[PDB]
Amino acid sequence: PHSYGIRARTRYTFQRGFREHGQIRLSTYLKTYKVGDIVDIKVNGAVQKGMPHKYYHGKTGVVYNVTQSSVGVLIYKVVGNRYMEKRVNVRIEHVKHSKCRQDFLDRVKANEAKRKEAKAQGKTVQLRRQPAPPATAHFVSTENNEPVTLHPVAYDTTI
Amino acid sequence: PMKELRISKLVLNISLGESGDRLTRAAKVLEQLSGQTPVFSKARYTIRRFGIRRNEKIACHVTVRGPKAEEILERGLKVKEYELKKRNFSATGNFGFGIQEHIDLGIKYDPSIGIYGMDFYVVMDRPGMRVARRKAQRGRVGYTHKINAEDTINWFKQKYDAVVLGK
Amino acid sequence: KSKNHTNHNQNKKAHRNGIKRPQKHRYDSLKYRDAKFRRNQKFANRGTVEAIRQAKASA
Amino acid sequence: NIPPKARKIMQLLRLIQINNGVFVKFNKATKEMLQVVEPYVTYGIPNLKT
Amino acid sequence: KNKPYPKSRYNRAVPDSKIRIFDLGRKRAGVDEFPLCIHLVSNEYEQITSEALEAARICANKYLVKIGGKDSFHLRVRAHPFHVVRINKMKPNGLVARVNIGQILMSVRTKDSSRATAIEALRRCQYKFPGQQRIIVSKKWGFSQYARDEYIEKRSRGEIIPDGCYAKFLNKRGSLQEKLDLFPEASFNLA
């Protein structure tokens, strides 16, 4: 009762979104990809050619090769006690950039700008992030906000 | 100054239901009446009970437009004595009828060739209907600009000295 | 009875030696790249080597 | 009878043996780790004498 | 604990449900009549069969008819048996109703004078059902969702127009003309 087809168990994985069928947006073809870019793999059901396997759907990798209409996303997959390098050739319709890399680039630019500014000002820079600190001490006031006493509510029929 | 109802096209058909020598002569008389080569109306499928020739010619029709179409319609009203029923006019503005023995028109006939009927259909439109027919920037005509049964009744009754039934 | 498939101990066995990661190398073989790209990079790298050699020899 | 995730967290907290105690700075990452290993450890606020 | 097994194209051999009629009483009732409601609701998840539902329906119908008459009850069976519990043929065998906690099994609407009659009827009907059931006096006007005080305030304003057993209720949505023509007594507050 088990089959090993390429698109087996992809009924909802490869489905287009609700009110999202029909024409494919053309900004995907205008996006530029380079070797070393970190991209996400999201299979588009309308583009049957260049389709990656269902395993790589939702994964993230690095492009090593760029062709006319496809990229070379590189993935690491567990096959037991080790990772193996998988080189998938995927059409750009199933490929989008990772917003984390754009956020990381902006963070690096901000860190360098702060570093130069602190060097000019001759003070500390504090370029390292920190986890959420414990809450400090405050002085919550009660004027016009007098506390209201609450009591548990008795059980009653609600039908 | 622009809501001028005018005749767009006229579709003429023969009421025989048979193909062969009758259909070929029907196509010939249609060509003589209209001045245009016909198109053989086809059957989209076959029926065992009737045995209609599938994908083969069953009927004939042409479409006439312009002054010649109006002249043909005037001749069709001449045989129809300018009397029509209100049921003939659809809610979309189209109107038509059908008369047997097309010899009532301006043509000479004989029994050897045969006798064939003639049904007329007229499509009514106003200037500006190209919006719904053009390939580029196609849109929907406005509700007020669309043709309705009352509008085509009034247009038909204004001229031709014709009357409709009191249904 | 045959067909006794199970996956109880497979994950524990895999994690006993861990999930090994492939060795990282700075350069990857160009056989995975485009043929035209690899052929041109051969000449580009060659000319770069001669330019560096000529600069060092002149210096 | 320790699940693998709680075992890894206690290894990273150096809580390897029973009745072992460590001092930890309390932040969001530490708080979530202690939440996962809640059934196996007890933690609180130490004072100067402790 | 089995997965739901409804009648589908994959298994079309599901036998017919034993219970056919679901409502008994004045099905063409009105808003003014039947202002009180009594519910018999299971207290746990059971698998009440259509055969048990048939027996309870017969007992409730006979008792209510003989002791209160035709015009003093509008009992209905909320449970609809769709799940199939298979039994080996000597494969679908019968139909059962899957009911969770708090799911209404039987609901009757009567007048205020027939509260005790409805309570007695649904108390005697518990012996025909597997598991434990409770009887509650609903605070809503009949089978409608609005409570007693909300319904009487709506009726006093004039926002309710009876339509058969149920009724149409005014809402602040839609064109004004279609509501103003229908409701003569609706006092639209200009605020």
Added chain:
Amino acid sequence: KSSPYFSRYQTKYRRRREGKTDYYARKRLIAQAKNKYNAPKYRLVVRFSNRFVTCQIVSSRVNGDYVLAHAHSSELPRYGIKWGLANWTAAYATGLLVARRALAKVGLADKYEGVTEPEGEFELTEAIEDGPRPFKVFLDVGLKRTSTGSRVFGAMKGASDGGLFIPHSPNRFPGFDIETEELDDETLRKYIYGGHVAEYMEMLIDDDEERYQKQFSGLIADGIESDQLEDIYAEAYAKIREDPSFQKSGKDAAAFKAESLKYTQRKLTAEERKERFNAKVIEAGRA
């Protein structure tokens, strides 16, 4: 046309709904090979209204499209073409104008002159043995059907003669033979220099004088004979080549802004809507 039908309805793209953009052809028109990276693909967009001809060179980006060179047939009267601005010859002239402007903008005007006199011969603008390649543009006809002797290919021929490298076949040019697969230079020259228009003037002078008065009223107002059309077109082409620069009109846009707001309407406020709602309720005679 029910509520579930409206909920499940998925609208097409805005330009598809208004019938302006063919996205199936657009995708192949703007799709650069990913190994060519940020090299733009330029389209010679040609559009025809009932009176004018629009020719543009467009490069597509993620945020939108960018116009490199503009040439409108309404600018032809500046060069001498005051009579006829939506025909085959006008499309050729504005295609030549946009080609010269684009070459000037990209610094290739002196290196690629195309052909000086249009003799109606299929000749792709070739590259030099040791020099930059010609500027390559791809024809964009939109929703216009591509038939033989179409004005879109007329503008394409004008741009190709201007200097833009537009890959094309001599198949849709006016006068091409469908049997022998041959292109006749005589009729191509006729369409290039408006000889077909001149023939129409001669045919209408021969008979149906009233039709000629009704149709060619603009030409008669200035008193132009059919034999001068070739002279006017040739001189206009020379003038376009000599001075293709676009004259940016300096008319005050602030006055146009002010006059447009004079008739521009405004939406009602929430309080006004409530007041009108109350007024309608009172006027309904049911409050």
Added chain:
RNA sequence: GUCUACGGCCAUACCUAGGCGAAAACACCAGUUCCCGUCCGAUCACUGCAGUUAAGCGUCUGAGGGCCUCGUUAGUACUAUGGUUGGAGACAACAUGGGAAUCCGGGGUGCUGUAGGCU
């Protein structure tokens, strides 16, 4: 600001009904000799500007149908972890955490990039 051409997001843009649109543009519109295609210059073609804002188009108005957004529903349903918890069981409560959908109500009914025309 309005219009045109090319677009980006692809309904806070669709569908319906009713009020307005100065200039320009667009469109409707007048013809079939030429290129072209049809039973039919209806569509596709070409050549035009006599006529019209009436249709398209733009905008405004619906206690409009939808669509978008925010709160109620509701920390409710559900769920990770725990007990030598209760209960015969079904299930339920509690403890350390995460946390909906739907309904209803309030608000809104396209924004924007490039190139050019407009009393």
Added chain:
RNA sequence: GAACAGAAAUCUCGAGUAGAAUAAAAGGGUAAAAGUCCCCUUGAUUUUGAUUUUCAGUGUGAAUACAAACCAUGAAAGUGUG
């Protein structure tokens, strides 16, 4: 609405988010198309390496993106190694 007599066979005008079709089961995809019609063709061609699935990352089968030639089609961008 048009004949005739039920036959919506057939012919028109409007509504119509796909409720049709897409060779054979089901799922997914597709509306100026991936459906229907028309025209031309044989990319259902030769060769090499790379990659994915089943995998031990062996074989077989199937498939993906390229490269070197010769071509088809289109005005072209391009699309074609069933």
Added chain:
RNA sequence: AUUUCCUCAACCUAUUCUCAAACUUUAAAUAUGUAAGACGCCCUUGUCGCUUAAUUGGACGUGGGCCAUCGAAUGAGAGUU
């Protein structure tokens, strides 16, 4: 009676009872992919037979400035035959 009734069936409209492992607009918890700068960031310049209309771009490089939170927490020597 090609004029009508009300049981007969049928269509549509707005409420109303109850479900779906092989239904779904939505949609969790748990689990899961990637990243957390020195092989790093900014300017000068060289190579190419690839690519671009074009030193245009891609890739590989070269020489100089930022090496003092080397850019979340915790822990731990690791990897390959």
Added chain:
RNA sequence: UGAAAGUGAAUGCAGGUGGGAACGCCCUUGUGGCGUGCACCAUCGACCGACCCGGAAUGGAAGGGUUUGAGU
């Protein structure tokens, strides 16, 4: 190396790049810079054989290649 007839391994410092033991030179204590760089790995090439080419009686000298070998 090829089935075989046969042919048969230096453009260079026996090549370039990255990491890299040991050593030497400085900065000042650094998880510091500079210079070469054994072994080993990864990688870009070069040479020999086979194959596929063009290929200017017999020979395949020069030019190549998306390749192939348990080679230098």
